[PDB]
Structures are given as C-alpha cells and as structure tokens.
Amino acid sequence: IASASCTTXICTCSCSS
C-alpha cells in the first residue's frame, strides 16, 4: 500500500538510490 519502487498496481515503485 506504500513503499518506494516496489509494486505493480497502486503507484509507487522506485525513484532514486
């Protein structure tokens, strides 16, 4: 339901490092 970089269907995913 939340994270950064890490799912397929709601909206987060990734975006740095």
How far is residue 1 from each of residues 7, 13, 14, measured CA to CA in Å? 9, 11, 14
Chain mean position to CA 1: 9
Q: What share of the chain is helix, strand, coil (3-state, %, to 5)?
A: 0, 0, 100
Method: X-ray
At 9, give phi and psi (nearest 5°). Answer: -145, -15
Angle at 7 between CA 13 and CA 4, to 5 degrees: 35
- C-alpha–C-alpha distance, residues 10 and 17, integer Å: 21
Residue 11: what residue type? C
